Design a protein around this ligand. Structure first.
Ligand SMILES: CSc1nc2c(Br)c(Br)c(Br)c(Br)c2[nH]1
Ligand SMILES: CSc1nc2c(Br)c(Br)c(Br)c(Br)c2[nH]1
Lengths: 325, 325
């Protein structure tokens, strides 16, 4: 498999663009930034709102829990290539604890409103708008040869008042290389594309669209996560129970990929579930023919069938938002 | 039915934008333009290359065969609204024979190469490129609330050397009005969308995409016309024999449209014909998974399922052309 778009970005760019292991970090002053209050935390870092001692501007300090120098160079190089692009979290500085080497990435500040409390307030248009904004981030990084590999609400910071959105956490992000096999233990479970659940290692930008699709199904259907699987195997089961297994079968055959006997019998056989069957009084006003049509073109077993970010932005669903533009 | 996009363009614009009957033509000097040589001719006009006596710049003089003042105002008003837009034939002046009222529309000159001789020379990329260019014309007029209703090679002037393309002949063009029934005797037969063949009068911009789809199938498969039907009825037969009749059935049912018993039994029952079954040594190099995928998304019975012009431009098929941009 090869990405249907932006497949040669890296092959035509200077090696120093993608050769992240060959990055020599320019550490700044661990001082210019003061932690003001812990505002978040993944298992790969603790996050705090912070102040830039110099200009007093707010900032976000991401202190990294012991990371292999090679992975940090990846996240850093990726942040550097995408810095300036639409809705990409701006990396303002890299610093380190003098005494112990602990890295902290300094980013632009985003007065974010956690999704668990923001999404239920979102109007039909709001969702359309924000998803749209997220699509600019995605189409942009994809156009730079980068797979985020970790799309999800948690990684989409949103300032509702300013309507400013930023795709964050490029720690699981990777450069796309035509015909390269990648680890399928990326992205959060509930957003893991089928290809990740069936060890189809030669994936691409499309991985993200599925993630987005999951995030979108969650927002319109008000069901977060949309595919709540306790474990990777069960994750493929929550999917098959929605997309149907015959679709899965076609996917598996097209890419000559087998399934492990155990999971195989666990995913059993399920008929495709109409998207409208997820509709209820609570989300009826967010569901629409276009929302369904857009979502249907996102959640495709075949990563090759999924809408590319650029195509998603032109789907009529986004027409009103584009018109405001 | 209502267009999935640009549906409210006219409803939000000043009435003088679409009220073409209320146009008061500003006739110029029938003199400034001299016919140099007949270069074309439809049944609604004779076309000649011409010279602008003033600046000596070449021009195209379209002398209209007796037209109802109401239709001329339509073509003229439409040409005026779209003048300046991407690849839209530029209307430079409207004049009239003093002695007899015969109208002549003066347009920009295009050193065109008839398609019957140009297309066979076109490379894979050339086709992609030109179709792309045509899509800008289409997405633009559609975004102004106008249905061309007559897309076809004959109406796409092309200067291969300059790679300049213009969508011409807006004589069958009309303003789009949400929920309005239009005459289905528009566009040339071989490019008539199914909706035109089954009297689905509430069509929209999508009509054009089918036309384009036909033109595209002709160019990649080297089969002009692609759907060669001797008459409107037989036109729906050449289609059903390709898209299959069950698809047709779904279309007919969704829009509660019956078929006339006569044609009904004439279209009989046919299975869908894989697009790749139109491939042969002569067009093999122009056919590709993306070309097929793009075409498949154009030739849909359901005008609502067809790619909108804006969506077609973002289809991976056009990726290389967009990259050159
Ligand atoms: C889970 S709470 C949280 N808020 C964040 C903001 Br605002 C930014 Br900007 C960045 Br970078 C990260 Br990482 C964040 N993590
Ligand atoms: C069929 S030959 C022909 N060539 C044309 C050119 Br060049 C232009 Br510009 C326009 Br407007 C029209 Br109508 C044309 N008709």
């Amino acid at each position: 498999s090869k990405a249907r778009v932006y497949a040669d970005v890296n092959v035509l760019r200077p090696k120093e663009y993608w050769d992240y292991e060959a990055l020599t970090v320019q550490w700044g002053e661990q001082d210019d930034y003061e932690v003001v209050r812990k505002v978040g935390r993944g298992k790969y870092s603790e996050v705090f709102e912070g102040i830039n001692v110099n200009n007093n501007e707010k900032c976000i300090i991401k202190i990294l829990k012991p990371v292999k120098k090679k992975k940090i160079k990846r996240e850093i190089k990726i942040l550097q290539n995408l810095c300036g692009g639409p809705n990409i979290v701006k990396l303002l500085d890299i610093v380190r604890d003098q005494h112990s080497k602990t890295p902290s990435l300094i980013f632009e500040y985003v007065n974010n409103t956690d999704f668990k409390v923001l999404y239920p307030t979102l109007t039909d248009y709001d969702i359309r708008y924000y998803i749209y904004e997220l699509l600019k981030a995605l189409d942009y990084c994809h156009s730079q040869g980068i797979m985020h590999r970790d799309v999800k609400p948690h990684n989409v910071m949103i300032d509702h008042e300013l309507r400013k959105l930023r795709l964050i956490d490029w720690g699981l992000a990777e450069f796309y290389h035509p015909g390269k096999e990648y680890n399928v233990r990326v992205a959060s479970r509930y957003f893991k594309g089928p290809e990740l659940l069936v060890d189809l290692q030669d994936y691409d930008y499309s991985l993200d669209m599925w993630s987005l699709g999951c995030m979108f199904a969650g927002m319109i259907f008000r069901k977060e996560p949309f595919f709540y699987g306790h474990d990777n195997h069960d994750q493929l089961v929550k999917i098959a129970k929605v997309l149907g297994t015959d679709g899965l079968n076609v996917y598996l055959n097209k890419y000559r990929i087998e399934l492990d006997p155990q999971l195989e019998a666990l995913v059993g056989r399920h008929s495709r579930k109409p998207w409208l069957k997820f509709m209820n009084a609570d989300n009826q006003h967010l569901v629409s023919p276009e929302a369904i049509d857009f979502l249907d073109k996102l959640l495709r077993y075949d990563h090759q069938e999924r809408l590319t970010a650029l195509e998603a932005m032109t789907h009529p669903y986004f027409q009103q938002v584009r018109a405001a533009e």
